[PDB]
Amino acid sequence: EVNLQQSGTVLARPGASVRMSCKASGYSFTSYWLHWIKQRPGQGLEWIGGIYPGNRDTRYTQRFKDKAKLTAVTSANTAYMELSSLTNEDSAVYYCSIIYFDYADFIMDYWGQGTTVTVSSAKTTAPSVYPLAPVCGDTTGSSVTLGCLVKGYFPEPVTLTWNSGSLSSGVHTFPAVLQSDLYTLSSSVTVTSSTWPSQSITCNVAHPASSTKVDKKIEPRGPT
Amino acid sequence: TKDTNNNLC
Amino acid sequence: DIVMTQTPLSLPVSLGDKASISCRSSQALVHSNGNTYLHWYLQKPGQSPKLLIYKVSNRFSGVPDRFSGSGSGTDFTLKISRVEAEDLGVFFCSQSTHVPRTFGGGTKLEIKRADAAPTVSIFPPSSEQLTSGGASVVCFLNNFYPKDINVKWKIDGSERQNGVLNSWTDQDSKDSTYSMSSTLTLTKDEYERHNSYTCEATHKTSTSPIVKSFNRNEC
């Protein structure tokens, strides 16, 4: 028992505001404080504030004093955090968290998956998925490497996978880089020259921020 | 009871 | 804000070795109730922090015995008696006896292994991208060690730094190696005007640059 479900990825515009949730279960939602923490891509962790659902009493740090608003609907064991007047600094991942250490036979310390917020004025863009195959029959030996290029998409995340996730050994999914408001992703899979193209290899790309869902097949090909 | 960190105080 | 200072910030270690992280706080962490709420977390890239030890020396459910905790007042130590390949990530000590609850900057534990030369692959632009007028030439340099490396693209001989996207992966939780993909983009037109395309990278595993190239419109 005891887990925290946080709402999904949110794309927000500067100056706007976002409301995100955290649903709890496994412990008495109205008897402990619930925390919220921020973590920037590079940076460490910083505590925003907490809330005691029992009597709706809150607590904040001077920094987020006017940046965050906390609430909670106890009839649904759900808590909320609202960030106002967004900027580039507000862009980060947020976690709700519960800790408790005074009862030995019930130690609590859990974190939601976290909610990644992206503050941008950029517009959603479906990704272009391109298959990466070696030209002709030449080979490095016994193993061959195939690839999948996924570029020009925003915002993220993207969910790359091979043969519906049935092929996971020998795979390298590189972090997305950003080229002026656009993300490029690439992934490579390495298999024995016997399996491919005798056995299908397919790249499965999904971009929920634009409901795009591609299944590119790595076919063999000729010179350029 | 308890702190903001849920410790007995 | 009672400050937490961890040291060192980066921790190079070899499998089997022992490791140590020091955590210090600007003020005492002994709560009036009598306990000392100092904890240690581990955060794998892409996940939320996971508790290892609470109240300075208590191992959380499911945490290996290889991990121990000591400390008093302001001085605390986390110890990894034996470093496996799972221990990859950043360790954070944390305080919760004062408000706000604070975390240290963290210590990234890096593994040292036997050097390994990269496996390089070159990929000409697909035709699907060609139709759009663009042409991305990709190069994969998988499973190498150490992490230091530098890729180089030479079109018809000369180097080309303009228009390259490099991306790296965290130290592998299996190989303890690294990988990277270098992507050189051009315009169909520019790609059309040359024949030789090279991806060469110099790495410790050799005194001569690992080369990989292809001639356009040729097997």
DSSP string for residues in C22-80: EEEESS--B-TTS-B-EEEEEE-TTS--EEEEETTTEEPTT--TTEEEEEETTEEEEEE
- Rounded Cα distance between A58 and C205, Å, is 57
State how far the Cα of A62 lies from the Cα of A19, in Å rounded to an integer: 20
CB contacts of A36 in chain B (<8 Å) are: none
Tell me the chain C residues in contact with residue A134 when contact means C-beta distances shorter than 8 Å: 121, 123
Tell whether C101 is within 8 A of chain B (Cβ): yes
All residues of chain C having their beta carbon less than 8 Å from the beta carbon of residue B4 are 99
Taking contacts as CB-CB distances below 8 angstroms, the residues of chain A near B9 are none
| Residue that is written with structure tokens 């906390």 in the block | A70
Gap between the Cα atoms of A214 and A205, Å rounded: 5
- A50 touching chain B per CB within 8 A: yes
**Within a domain: residue C12?**
yes
Instruction: Establish if C219 belongs to a structural domain.
Output: no
Smallest Cα distance from C1 to chain B, Å: 14
Q: Are residue C91 and residue C140 in the same domain, yes or no?
A: no
Same domain, C51 and C135: no
What gap in Å lies between CA C65 and CA C80, rounded to an integer? Answer: 9
Question: How far is Cα A116 from Cα A157, in angstroms, rounded to an integer?
Answer: 9
Q: What's at C94, amino acid-wise? A: S
Distance CA A185, CA A152 (A): 9
Distance CA A18, CA A93 (A): 13
Establish if A27 touches chain B: CB-CB under 8 angstroms: no
Residue ranges and CATH numbers for the domains of chain A are 1-121 (2.60.40.10), 122-220 (2.60.40.10)
Q: Where are the beta strands (DSSP E) in A9-166?
A: 10-12, 18-25, 34-39, 45-52, 57-60, 68-73, 78-83, 93-100, 108-111, 115-119, 128-132, 143-153
Distance from CA of B6 to the nearest CA of C (A): 9
User: Which residue type sits at A165?
Assistant: G
Q: Are residues C44 and C97 located together in one domain of the fold?
A: yes
Whether residues C73 and C83 fall in one domain = yes
Q: Do the domain assignments include residue C44?
A: yes
Tell me, yes or no, whether C74 and C30 share the same domain: yes
A221 Cβ under 8 Å from any chain C Cβ? yes
Cβ <8 Å between B3 and A101:
no
Beta-strand relationship, A115-119 and A10-12? parallel
Of C33, C96, C99, Cβ closest to residue B8: C33
Shortest distance between the Cα of B8 and any Cα of chain A, in A, equals 7
Contacts of A207 (CB under 8 A, 6+ apart): A126, A127, A153, A158, A159, A213
Structural domain total, chain C: 2
CB A147 within 8 A of CB A187: yes
Strands (E) across chain C are located at 4-7, 10-14, 19-25, 38-43, 50-54, 58-59, 67-72, 75-80, 89-95, 102-103, 107-112, 119-123, 134-144, 150-155, 158-159, 164-168, 178-187, 196-202, 210-215
**Tokens representing residue C58 in the block:** 């208590």
Region of residue A105 (left: phi > 0; alpha: psi -120 to 50; beta: else): alpha
Cα–Cα distance measured from residue C35 to residue C31, given in angstroms and rounded to the nearest whole number: 6
CA distance linking residue C170 with residue A174, whole number of Å = 9
Q: How far apart are CA C110 and CA C176, in angstroms?
A: 9
Report the C-alpha gap between A106 and C151 in whole angstroms.
52
C187 falls within a domain: yes
Q: Is C219 in contact with A223 (Cβ distance < 8 A)?
A: yes
The DSSP letter of residue C82 is S
**Do residue C69 and residue C107 come from a single domain?**
yes
Q: Which of C101, C136, C217 is closest, CB to CB, to A224?
A: C217
* CB distance C20 to C79 below 8 Å: yes
Resolution in Å equals 2.6
Q: CA C198: distance to chain centroid?
A: 27
Tell me whether residues B5 and C37 touch, CB distance under 8 A: yes
Looking at CA atoms only, how far is residue B2 from chain A in angstroms?
A: 8
The verdict on residue C162 lying in a domain is yes
**Is residue C124 domain-shared with residue C36, that is, in the same domain?**
no
d(CA C78, CA C85): 18
On whether both C180 and C126 belong to a single domain, the answer is yes
Task: State which H helix or E strand residue A183 sits in.
Answer: strand A183-192
Q: How many angstroms separate the CA atoms of C177 and A170, rounded?
A: 13
| C102 interfacial to chain A (CB closer than 8 Å) | yes
Pairing of β C134-144 and β C178-187 = antiparallel
Chains in contact with A via at least 3 Cβ–Cβ pairs below 8 Å: B, C
Question: C152 and C73, same structural domain?
Answer: no
Does residue C108 share a domain with residue C2? yes
Which of C85, C113, C141 is the endpoint of a domain? C113
Q: Which two tokens stand for residue A126?
A: 């479906």
Can you tell me the distance from the alpha carbon of C84 to that of C66, in angstroms, rounded to the nearest whole number?
9
Contacts 24+ apart (CB under 8 A), A101-108: A101/B6, A101/B7, A101/C35, A101/C37, A101/C54, A101/C55, A101/C96, A102/B2, A102/B6, A102/B7, A102/B8, A102/C33, A102/C35, A107/C54, A107/C58, A107/C60, A107/C61, A108/A2, A108/A27, A108/A32
C14 belongs to a structural domain:
yes
DSSP structural state of residue C190: H
CATH code for the domain in which residue C123 is found: 2.60.40.10
Cα gap C198→C139, rounded to integer Å: 9
The sign of the dihedral angle between the CA atoms of A78, A81, A82, A88 is: negative
C204 CB-contact burial (10 Å; exposed 0-12 / middle 13-18 / buried 19+): middle
Token pair 């995340």: residue = A157
Scored b (16 or more CB within 10 A) or e, C39-61 reads: bbbbbeeeebbbbbbbbbeebbe
Domain containing C23: what range? 1-113
Of C80, C113, C146, the last residue of a domain is: C113
Does the beta carbon of C35 lie under 8 angstroms from any beta carbon of chain B? yes
Q: What is the residue whose two structure tokens read 């390089």?
A: C120
Token reading at C71: 């400390």
For residue C103, tell me if it sits in a domain. Answer: yes
> What number of CA atoms fall less than 13 Å from residue A169's CA on the CB side?
3
Element (H, E) at A216: strand A212-217
Q: Which of C113, C148, C173 is the last residue of a domain?
A: C113
Q: Which chain A residue lies closest to C47 (C-alpha atoms)?
A: A113
Tokens coding A99: 């800790």
C129: Cα separation from own chain's centroid = 31
Other Cβ atoms within 10 Å of A102 Cβ, number: 15
CB of C96 within 8 Å of a chain B CB? The answer is yes
Distance CA C123, CA A135 (A): 8
Q: Return the residue in C123, C164, C191 with the most chain A beta carbons within 10 A, the one to mutate for interface testing.
A: C123
- Is there a domain that residue C102 lies in? yes
Q: How far apart are the first and last CA of chain A?
A: 56
Give just the sign of the alpha carbon dihedral C80, C76, C101, C30.
positive
User: Are residues C127 and C190 located together in one domain of the fold?
Assistant: yes
Looking at the structure, tell me whether residues C127 and C184 fall in a common domain: yes
Residue count of chain C = 219
Q: Give the number of A-B residue pairs with CB atoms closer than 8 Å.
A: 18
The Cα of C64 is separated from the nearest Cα of chain B by a number of Å equal to 26
| DSSP label of C116 | B
The residue count for chain A = 224
Q: Name the strand (E) or helix (H) holding A206.
A: strand A202-207
User: How many whole angstroms separate alpha carbon A47 and alpha carbon C102?
Assistant: 7
Report chain A residues whose CB lies below 8 A from the CB of B3: 33
